[PDB]
Structure formats: structure tokens, C-alpha cells
């Protein structure tokens, strides 16, 4: 038979295996880079929560529309996905969680709204449809908050109309260096959670409010939400990197298995061919 082609197939598979190995190493480097990237966003949110808590403990006389909670009629949802697949089934189980949750909510007769990030999810929910108003791609590994800004403002204004009452961030929590899980958590409705905790006194010192404290606090909430979105994007990007790395490893392993399979069959076939040809020769020689 065409044994040389079989050997060529083997060689191609070997090459593919090495390429997968390279995929894994590149993914590892990207993982470490993004893992570094996560930590840099801490002090911003840390200090900003600190000062917001200082404000609210200094001014409990009123609240903010983002600090308040009224009965929910509709919700907005924000999901972040890759531009390209192949990175595990992070999009898969993400979609599973979101669809079961949305079904849980519609039987509560509450509508669901969306702004989309990541081409895969973009398609996944365009085909389903839904009440989507935002869509973005070309995020890259280090996007600009500018890029998120349009969408996030869309959710902001929609919440201001009172149409949307809860907004949930949908991403994948980086559980550890290998395993990560999807996470869907409401963010626009906020309740005191370390906003009424981690405090033991209201400081007799306070800042003077050069602009109106109300508008100042509003701009604050703006920045805080945007930063939350940004770090979530970072985390899910890292999770994508992890999943891609693992999938490449598995691909290498399957390649090795198939290589064994082909090699064994090749040995058998070579033996058979030799037998056939020698039988032919001896019969032909015996003819005379």
C-alpha cells in the first residue's frame, strides 16, 4: 500500500504535536503576564472603597440610585468572552449557567437585557436573540477602559431609566492557576458588603466637598463600576489563557496516542506486504 503517505501523516502529526507544545508555552507566558496584570488594579478600588465608605459614614442622610434597591422588573447582563475559541469550554459552561439563570428569571416574569463582549458570545446570543443593546469585540489582552466605556455607559443610562433594575456581571472567576469557574454576580444594585463592614468609627475629620457631594459621589460610582468591569475582563482573559493551555496539553497527548496507533498498524502492513511479495516471487520461480 501507499506506506510513504502513512509515514508522512505520522510526520505531520509529530509536527502538530510540537506546535501544540509551543502553544502551551506561549499560553503559559500569557498566563503569567495576565496574572501579574490582575494585582495592579487593587489599590485603586481599595482606596476608592475606603473613601466612599468614609463619605457614606459621613453622609447617611440620603442614598444613591446605585445604592438603592427597588423591586426588579428587568435586568441587564454583561458577558465577556474571547474573540477566538479553542480555550477549553469556558464559553460553553458560561453559556449554560447564563441560560439556566435567565430561564429562572423569566419564570419570575422579569425581562433580560444584554450588552455583549467577545465574538463567540456575540454569535451565541445573536442567534438566540434576546434584548441585547451592546456588542463589542477586538478587546485584546490589554484593552482600554475607553473600549468598555460606551457599553458601560449604556448600562448606566438604562439603569437610570428604571427599566433595568439589577445588572449582573458575567465572567469566569479565576479559582486557581488551573481551574476557573463562571461567575454571574449583580453589581449595579449594591448593598453594604464591606461598605457597612470593615469599619469601626466615623472619622471626626472629613474632607470638604469642593463640588456638590451628590454629583461627586455619582462620578465616584461611575468610576468604581467601570474599574470593577475592567478587572473582571482581566480575570476572564487569564481564565481563557488557562483553558487554552490545558486544551493544548490534551491535544499533544492525543497526538501521541494516535502516533502509537499508526505505528503499530504500519508495522502490521509492512509485514503483510513483505509476505505477499515473497509468496509471489516464490510461486513465480516455482513455475519453472
Amino acid at each position: 500500500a501507499n506506506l510513504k503517505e502513512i509515514r508522512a501523516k505520522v510526520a505531520s502529526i509529530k509536527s502538530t504535536q510540537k506546535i501544540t507544545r509551543a502553544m502551551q508555552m506561549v499560553a503559559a507566558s500569557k498566563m503569567r503576564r495576565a496574572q501579574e496584570r490582575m494585582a495592579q488594579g487593587r489599590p485603586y478600588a481599595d482606596n476608592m472603597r475606603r473613601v466612599i465608605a468614609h463619605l457614606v459614614q459621613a453622609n447617611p442622610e440620603y442614598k444613591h440610585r446605585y445604592m438603592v434597591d427597588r423591586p426588579v422588573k428587568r435586568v441587564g447582563y454583561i458577558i465577556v468572552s474571547s474573540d477566538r475559541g479553542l480555550a477549553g469550554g469556558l464559553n460553553i459552561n458560561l453559556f449554560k449557567k447564563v441560560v439556566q439563570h435567565v430561564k429562572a428569571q423569566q419564570e419570575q416574569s422579569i425581562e433580560v437585557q444584554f450588552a455583549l463582549i467577545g465574538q463567540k458570545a456575540v454569535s451565541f446570543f445573536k442567534n438566540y436573540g434576546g434584548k441585547v443593546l451592546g456588542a463589542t469585540t477586538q478587546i485584546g489582552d490589554a484593552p482600554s477602559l475607553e473600549q468598555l466605556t460606551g457599553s458601560v455607559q449604556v448600562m448606566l443610562d438604562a439603569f437610570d431609566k428604571g427599566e433595568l433594575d439589577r445588572i449582573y456581571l458575567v465572567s469566569n472567576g479565576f479559582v486557581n492557576a488551573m481551574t476557573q469557574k463562571p461567575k454571574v454576580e449583580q453589581l449595579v444594585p449594591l448593598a453594604p458588603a464591606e461598605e457597612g463592614d470593615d469599619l469601626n468609627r466615623t472619622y471626626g475629620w472629613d474632607y470638604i466637598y469642593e463640588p456638590e457631594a451628590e454629583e461627586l459621589l455619582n462620578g465616584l460610582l461611575v468610576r468604581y463600576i467601570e474599574s470593577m468591569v475592567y478587572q473582571g475582563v482581566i480575570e476572564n482573559v487569564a481564565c481563557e489563557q488557562s483553558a487554552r493551555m490545558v486544551a493544548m496539553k490534551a491535544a499533544t497527548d492525543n497526538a501521541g496516542q494516535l502516533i502509537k496507533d499508526l505505528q503499530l498498524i504500519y508495522n502490521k502492513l509492512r509485514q503483510a506486504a513483505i509476505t505477499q511479495e515473497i509468496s509471489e516471487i516464490v510461486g513465480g520461480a516455482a513455475a519453472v
Partner: protein
């Protein structure tokens, strides 16, 4: 500001003398943009291609395994 620590939560800031340095922020912007191009230019080109040819013609082999002739 506090009597001992002061900080700015920057919407967007750059170590720079003037907005003329906008010619500099776009440098890193397009750098990361080029990297974003690169990740696809390798990912699909490496993964999708090679893996595509892998399972492609394997069937004609698996069907002729026990061939005695």
C-alpha cells in the same frame, strides 16, 4: 489628600508635559493592538490549520487495517 498621604485616582494620566505627548500613548496603544493582531495571526494559523489536516485523511487508513491483500 490626607496630612500624610495624597493620591489621585486617575481616569487617564500619563507621565508627560502636555497633551502633545498624545503622540506617545498611541505608541503603546498600537503596540498592544499589534499584539492583538499577532495572537490571532498565530492562534488560528497554528491551531486551526494543523488540527484540520490531522483528522482529515485518517479514515482510509483505519478502514484498511486488517488488509491481507
Amino acid at each position: 489628600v490626607q496630612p500624610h498621604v495624597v493620591t489621585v485616582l486617575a481616569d487617564t494620566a500619563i507621565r508627560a508635559d502636555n497633551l502633545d505627548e498624545a503622540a506617545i500613548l498611541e505608541a503603546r496603544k498600537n503596540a498592544e493592538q499589534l499584539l492583538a493582531n499577532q495572537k490571532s495571526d498565530l492562534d488560528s494559523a497554528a491551531a486551526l490549520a494543523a488540527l484540520a489536516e490531522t483528522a482529515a485523511q485518517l479514515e482510509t487508513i483505519r478502514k484498511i487495517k486488517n488488509r491481507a491483500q
